[PDB]
Design a protein around this nucleic acid. Sequence first.
DNA 1: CCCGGACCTGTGACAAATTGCCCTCAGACGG
DNA 2: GGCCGTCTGAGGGCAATTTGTCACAGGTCCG
Length: 213
Amino acid sequence: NSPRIVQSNDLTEAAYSLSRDQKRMLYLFVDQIRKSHDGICEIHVAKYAEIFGLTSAEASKDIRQALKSFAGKEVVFYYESFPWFIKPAHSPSRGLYSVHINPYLIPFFIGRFTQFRLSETKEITNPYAMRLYESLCQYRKPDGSGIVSLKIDWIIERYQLPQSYQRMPDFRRRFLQVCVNEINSRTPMRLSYIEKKKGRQTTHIVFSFRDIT
DNA sequence: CCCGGACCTGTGACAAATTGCCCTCAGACGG
DNA sequence: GGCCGTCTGAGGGCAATTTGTCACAGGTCCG
Ligand SMILES: [Mg+2]
Ligand SMILES: [Mg+2]
Ligand SMILES: [Mg+2]
Ligand SMILES: [Mg+2]
Ligand SMILES: [Mg+2]
């Protein structure tokens, strides 16, 4: 029924810092690019509004501010760093935006891959929870279940979590619990976890999950 | 022995950021 | 033909929530 996103695992596991609105736009770019060699994409205000159930006004606000916050953002594949954009965005027509993605990023988008339908993620609010749901999809089985152990330091590096979450009680309270709650409340996935320890330090988080069925 | 100290946990406060809402007014189009 | 009524969207804002930071209470073990 709805668009099927696929992406190279290299993007799922890349290190970057994007907002919710920026990640939403990014899903459409990957969709446009894949359906084809030059990197120029386009976004319609009225289409964006309908996809994510926004008004035209608030859509316009989200696109405009997302777009100017890309400047200077960089992407690291573990390592190699790239800018997302190589030219400012611009609007030829009212309600229409044209963007220039770094053509050297194309092969990192299309490659060992991750896939999900866009309806699975479009109600998630916290961008770190989008990152977690993407990493879990990378390990999902056809039937809809999976289990994976992710290292905490790698979680911090890849999702570029803010500095105070290196204190484990803050990591638990403001990142782990919240994002597990959203996934359980906003996606068709049912997720559980347990902590792996070594001495006094907690080193990994072990995720198990199934599908509504 | 128990100390001060270096670790770990959780919670109460506050500061900074993001959310969906609300209102104005000109652009683009067709009847 | 050309004006105007309507559908858009580009601006300006808001209070209510969520996210990011740090002080302090309270556990263990070390030598
Ligand atoms: Mg952010
Ligand atoms: Mg917004
Ligand atoms: Mg005493
Ligand atoms: Mg007490
Ligand atoms: Mg004490």
